[PDB]
Ligand binder design. Structure first.
Ligand SMILES: C[C@H]1O[C@@H](n2cnc3c(N)ncnc32)[C@H](O)[C@@H]1O
Ligand SMILES: C[C@H]1O[C@@H](n2cnc3c(N)ncnc32)[C@H](O)[C@@H]1O
Lengths: 248, 249
């Protein structure tokens, strides 16, 4: 009877989920609202996380403490990093990582600022397990959960469903050269602001996790934000959750 | 039972002195986060080892709220100098903290390259909801009475100045001096570290008084490399500070 936890950051990324639940009960603690109900007769909790790494981690931790979910699906919209992808495509996160984590080597003021010399700062993803330090350079999507989403690709009719790497940061990048550099360096499919943070907390609690992100925008093709993509993503996720539930 | 003071540090060196100060301890670990529950001057205190960075800090703080319901939060530890007036061993009391790592940029085509001077602070990362209604935050103010108390205790600190300042939190360790200078000039930062504003965000959501207290363990503005002894010194000051609050309870 442990629920599926489904997350979205903004109201537009959760309202379609909420509408799908039967016998809803709403809970708000701190800044974070949860709707507890059923899908196909099975317990599901929808979480509106708010935006960014701190919010995502708090909302995920609070859900672990309150609901003890059996798996977490983090979803919502993202911006394209891979030129092959277009608005409406859905990325299933083979892995996510904190793309915004940076360490730089000492340079005197005369040398100016050069972000291309910044290194990914992996300590931000380091955890402890039974008190012992465990390094992480990324968080893998649960591979069975990833595979399931890919196997359901043809049920999504508003773009392609592809595996990719999700770069999480407290950033919205619109400098195309920066997007290109991040893609070349980290092989990112897309950027957003929550996935690796929720994933970090899921790893700490040893709960299976998958990130599912629709491209609502990509400055690589001049495609501006389309809020309807967030609805289409939730529709896919409802179908996906119901498939999991059929198998329970 | 009395609601505890919650005292946080990210790394072992930032909490071992606090933990040694508690009486009648028990140690609790959930997920990746360890807590020591005991007493200082007979009053309940929980010491939290948060691990490093914004996600860890927020998780550790949230878990503490759920498990322990503290009456106030002191987030402490070490930091790197951004203000050239400050040196290793000086302590900054956070008049405010903010997510210095949060960046938004306007559209530029590839040929214009990358320009971080055009990456603006992205305030949505600090936006919260209060009873379901959106509340914007461009920073989190340290509880002003807590901040004031720390400043009033300045001459009890034996190893440097105690000053008010702005704490810039980011999942970053900057050693490009031109970038440190740019951050200082843009945001009036005293120091940088990796947790404060994230713990502050959670404390604001829960409406629990919060103060950040950071010692400079390093500053590349003066060629001063990391000294771990500063972390011990900071904890000593924090214990004195906590005992003063407790006397007032
Ligand atoms: C503001 C909300 O929008 C998502 N989001 C959608 N597109 C982007 C993008 N190009 N860059 C960063 N975040 C994005 C964030 O993950 C966040 O939750
Ligand atoms: C790695 C630990 O060290 C702290 N810390 C100490 N000095 C710095 C600095 N110059 N920059 C960023 N973080 C620093 C972080 O807050 C983190 O917890």
């Amino acid at each position: 009877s442990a629920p599926i936890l489904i997350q979205g950051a903004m109201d537009v990324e959760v309202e379609t989920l909420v509408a799908a639940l039967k016998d809803k009960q709403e809970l708000t603690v701190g800044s974070w609202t949860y709707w507890q109900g059923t899908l196909s007769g099975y317990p599901v909790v929808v979480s509106r996380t708010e935006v960014g790494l701190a919010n995502a981690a708090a909302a995920t931790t609070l859900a672990m403490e309150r609901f003890q979910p059996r798996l977490v699906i983090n979803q919502g919209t993202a911006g394209g990093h891979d030129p092959a992808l277009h608005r409406g495509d859905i990325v299933i996160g083979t892995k996510s990582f904190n793309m915004g984590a940076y360490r730089s080597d000492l340079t005197p003021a005369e040398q100016g600022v050069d972000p291309s010399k910044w290194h990914n700062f992996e300590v931000t993803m380091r955890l402890r397990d039974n008190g012992k330090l465990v390094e992480h350079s990324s968080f893998a999507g649960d591979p069975e959960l990833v595979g399931r989403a890919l196997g359901m690709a043809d049920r999504y009719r508003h773009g392609r469903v592809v595996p990719g790497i999700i770069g999480t940061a407290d950033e919205w990048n619109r400098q195309v050269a920066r997007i290109n550099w991040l893609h070349q360096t980290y092989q990112t499919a897309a950027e957003e602001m929550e996935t690796s943070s929720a994933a970090l907390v899921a790893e700490a609690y040893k709960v299976p996790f998958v990130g599912i992100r629709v491209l609502s925008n990509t400055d690589l093709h001049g495609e501006e934000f389309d809020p309807q993509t967030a609805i289409h993503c939730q529709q896919f996720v409802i179908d996906y959750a119901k498939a999991l539930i059929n198998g329970f």
